[PDB]
């Protein structure tokens, strides 16, 4: 599952 | 986890 916040995107 | 911001990327 990944999340995108503004210009940054995280994946876990 | 790892996050990517623009052309650069960072973890933790």
Outline:
The complex is a heterodimer of chains A (12) and B (12). With 12 residues, chain A is an all-beta fold.
Structure commentary:
The complex is a heterodimer of chains A (12) and B (12). With 12 residues, chain A is mainly beta. In chain A, 0% of the residues lie in helices and 67% in strands. In chain A, strand 1 and strand 2 (8-11) form a beta hairpin. The termini of chain A are close together. Chain B has 12 residues and is mostly beta strands. Chain B has a two-stranded antiparallel sheet. The chains are: A mainly beta (12), B mainly beta (12). Chains A and B meet through strand 2 of A and strand 1 of B. The PDB classes it as de novo protein. Keywords: de novo design, disulfide-bridged peptide, heterodimer, penicillamine, DE novo protein.
| Quaternary | heterodimer
Q: Structural class given helices, strands, pairing of chain A?
A: mainly beta
Strands of the biggest beta sheet of chain B: in what spatial order?
A: 1-2
Span between N and C termini of chain B? 6 Å
Number of helices of chain A: 0
Estimate what percentage of residues of chain B fall within beta strands.
over 45%
Q: Biggest interface in this structure?
A: A-B, 6 and 6 residues
Number of strands of chain A: 2
Termini separation of chain A: 6 Å
Based on CA atoms alone, the radius of gyration of chain B comes out at 6 Å
Tell me the β content of chain A: over 45%
**Rg of chain A (CA only):** 6 Å
Number of H/I helices of chain B: 0
The secondary structure category of chain B is: mainly beta
Tally of DSSP β-strands of chain B = 2
How do the SSEs of chain B run, as a string of H and E?
Answer: EE
Element pattern of chain A in H and E = EE
Residue share in helix of chain A: under 10%
Biggest sheet: strand arrangement of chain A = 1-2
Blueprint of the fold:
The complex is a heterodimer of chains A (12) and B (12).
Chain A: E1 2-5, E2 8-11
Antiparallel strand pairs in A: 1-2
Chain B: E1 2-5, E2 8-11
Antiparallel strand pairs in B: 1-2
């Amino acid at each position: 599952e990944c999340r995108e916040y503004g210009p940054v995107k995280v994946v876990a | 986890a790892v996050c990517e911001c623009g052309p650069t990327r960072e973890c933790k």
